[PDB]
Design a protein around this ligand. Structure first.
Ligand SMILES: CCCCCCCCCCCCCCCCCC(=O)OC[C@H](COP(=O)([O-])OCC(O)COP(=O)([O-])OC[C@@H](COC(=O)CCCCCCCCCCCCCCCCC)OC(=O)CCCCCCCCCCCCCCCCC)OC(=O)CCCCCCCCCCCCCCCCC
Ligand SMILES: CCCCCCCCCCCCCCCCCC(=O)OC[C@H](COP(=O)([O-])OCC[N+](C)(C)C)OC(=O)CCCCCCCCCCCCCCCCC
Ligand SMILES: CCCCCCCCCCCCCCCCCC(=O)OC[C@H](COP(=O)([O-])OCC[N+](C)(C)C)OC(=O)CCCCCCCCCCCCCCCCC
Ligand SMILES: CCCCCCCCCCCCO[C@@H]1O[C@H](CO)[C@@H](O[C@H]2O[C@H](CO)[C@@H](O)[C@H](O)[C@H]2O)[C@H](O)[C@H]1O
Ligand SMILES: CCCCCCCCCCCCO[C@@H]1O[C@H](CO)[C@@H](O[C@H]2O[C@H](CO)[C@@H](O)[C@H](O)[C@H]2O)[C@H](O)[C@H]1O
Lengths: 97, 49, 82, 149
């Protein structure tokens, strides 16, 4: 409230200087209302737009012809075996075989 | 059988590449007597007598 | 047993399975705090309590944000001002 | 032959728990003193304390504007000097005065010292939790400055 001619964002809209226009619309409005989203537009369907859901579309199907193959294939180890040497696991986990 | 023995040896044995031999301050019977042959003799003559 | 490729899982396990007791303890503490809050609410309060909120400082002399209540010096015909 | 007549599955559960606990005691007894006490009590206890404190209490990163406002930590050990960005865990009932006293070690603080968060000055008779909820939601970085003006 100190530099009016230099702070235009906090100033009234040009429709307010015009002296001419159930319930009527307000006569005085600021340009600082531009910094709000739901100032003029309504808040309808505000919290219900993240609730319109659509399911995924991926199908997990692939035929598995093993008759074509006669050799084994390698396979990853995903986790360490804790069913054996459980007590020593923190003590040998840092070593490499 | 040979794989079994080699695996167990590599895991349990005291070596230059030790897996399980680590953080050793109180040793078990076998390793203690294998490292300290003086004590195996003394502990054994006492047992027989 | 183990291998270099399992360093991810080894680290994750070593650092996380000891935390599971603490996680369960946190869950139990939360249930007990909820139980006590609901028992207090059943007993009765001057101003309401928000159940799923962190802190509820509101009383006869205190707002729901920890400040003193405005216009609370006198008494009112309709009772509490809230 | 699964199960026996006259015996209950709950009795069998009690049996099993007894077996497990006895085996645990045997294995703890026949173990190294150097490692077992640490690995069974001190690391679990520290992890429990840390995780419980983090998951339950709520903390704040504290900063100070000027070096002249830093506290005197020469005497107390393990921290001879103030460093900005310290994580500080507080209770929900804590006020700004209590926080200030905690920072300055129950000693005479400077004059007109105030707390701010995202440029917004806190009153001293204010709950830190609610003040942060209002002014800096999910950015609890507090700053201590001198308000002379
Ligand atoms: C507050 C302070 C905190 C610090 C701790 C304080 C103390 C608290 C209590 C103890 C906590 C530490 C527990 C560590 C145990 C694990 C590692 C260990 O240290 O063991 C060393 C210790 C010594 O090891 P050792 O001397 O080298 O070898 C001797 C054998 O263990 C000797 O065994 P045995 O020959 O006499 O018998 C064989 C044994 C085998 O034990 C072993 O040696 C290996 C155990 C394998 C562990 C890893 C298994 C993980 C597998 C992944 C799970 C996948 C599930 C998939 C599910 C999919 C289904 C949809 O069989 C068992 O009893 C194991 C049962 C548990 C395995 C369950 C696996 C699933 C099968 C389900 C079966 C059905 C239920 C049971 C039915 C029985 C009737 C009720 O182990 C034992 O003494 C016995 C095994 C321990 C079994 C668990 C005991 C109960 C623990 C309760 C934990 C609850 C904690 C939460 C507390 C609450 C906080 C809020
Ligand atoms: C809930 C999710 C579970 C999903 C993951 C687990 C896999 C799902 C399948 C169920 C798991 C349980 C399988 C139990 C198999 C053991 C059966 C058995 O006979 O064991 C021998 C015991 C001991 O029997 P006994 O020794 O007393 O007498 C019989 C003796 N023999 C065997 C020689 C004939 O049998 C029982 O008495 C019943 C035990 C099974 C019931 C307990 C289930 C265990 C699961 C909970 C674990 C925690 C225990 C503490 C619970 C405290 C409750 C307050
Ligand atoms: C999706 C989940 C998948 C993962 C599965 C998650 C569940 C299973 C995960 C378990 C993996 C990790 C298990 C490691 C356990 C390590 C604990 C351990 O062994 O401790 C080290 C100690 C160290 O023993 P050590 O040092 O002599 O030998 C250890 C190994 N070496 C030789 C290589 C060093 O082990 C023990 O001997 C004690 C273990 C049994 C006790 C367990 C703790 C409970 C104790 C309760 C009784 C207290 C009695 C107090 C009485 C006081 C008076 C005397
Ligand atoms: C011995 C006591 C009981 C032991 C059993 C412990 C298992 C509890 C784990 C269930 C998962 C809890 O995860 C979450 O925690 C609490 C309830 O616990 C709830 O949390 C919510 O309601 C509770 C009411 O109790 C409030 O205190 C809390 O402020 C709010 O965030 C969540 O709705 C729930 O999703
Ligand atoms: C065998 C049964 C074991 C079941 C596990 C039960 C949980 C065990 C741990 C209980 C520890 C209780 O210790 C207590 O915890 C709460 C939450 O941190 C702390 O309380 C703190 O946070 C809560 C939540 O805002 C408020 O009370 C307040 O902000 C503050 O005092 C208490 O200062 C402390 O005294």
């Amino acid at each position: 409230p100190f530099m009016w001619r230099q702070r235009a964002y906090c100033a009234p809209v040009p429709s307010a200087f015009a002296s001419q226009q159930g319930v009527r619309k307000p006569l005085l409005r600021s340009n600082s209302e531009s910094l709000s989203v739901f100032s003029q537009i309504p808040d309808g369907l505000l919290g219900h737009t993240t609730s319109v859901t659509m399911g995924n579309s991926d199908i997990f199907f692939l035929p598995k012809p093993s008759n074509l193959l006669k050799i084994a294939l390698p396979a990853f180890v995903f986790m360490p075996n804790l069913t054996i040497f459980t007590r020593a696991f923190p003590f040998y986990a840092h070593t490499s075989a | 059988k040979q794989a079994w023995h080699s695996r167990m040896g590599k895991f349990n044995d005291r070596s230059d590449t030790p897996m399980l031999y680590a953080y050793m301050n109180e040793l078990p019977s076998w390793e203690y007597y294998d490292l300290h042959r003086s004590a195996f003799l003394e502990h054994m003559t006492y047992f027989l007598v | 047993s183990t291998s270099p490729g399992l360093a991810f899982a080894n680290l994750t396990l070593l650092l996380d399975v000891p935390q599971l007791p603490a996680i369960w303890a946190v869950n139990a503490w939360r249930e007990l705090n909820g139980l006590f809050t609901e028992m207090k609410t059943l007993a009765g309060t001057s101003d309401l309590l928000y159940p799923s909120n962190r802190y509820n400082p509101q009383n006869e002399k205190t707002n729901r944000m920890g400040r003193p209540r405005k216009y609370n010096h006198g008494e009112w015909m309709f009772g509490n001002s809230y | 032959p699964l199960g026996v007549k006259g015996r209950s599955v709950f009795a069998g559960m009690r049996s099993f728990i007894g077996q497990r606990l006895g085996r645990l005691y045997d294995s703890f007894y026949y173990s190294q003193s150097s490692t077992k006490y640490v690995m069974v009590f001190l690391f679990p206890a520290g992890i429990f304390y840390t995780r419980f404190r983090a998951d339950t209490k709520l903390g704040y990163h504290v900063f100070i504007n000027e070096e002249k406002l830093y506290p005197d930590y020469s005497q107390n050990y393990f921290d001879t000097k103030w460093t900005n960005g310290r994580k500080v865990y507080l209770d929900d009932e804590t006020t700004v005065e209590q926080l200030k006293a905690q920072i300055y070690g129950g000693k005479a603080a400077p004059e007109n010292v105030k707390v701010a968060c995202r440029g917004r000055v806190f009153e001293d008779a204010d709950n830190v939790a609610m003040a942060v909820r209002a002014f800096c939601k999910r950015d609890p970085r507090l700053l201590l400055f001198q308000d002379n003006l």
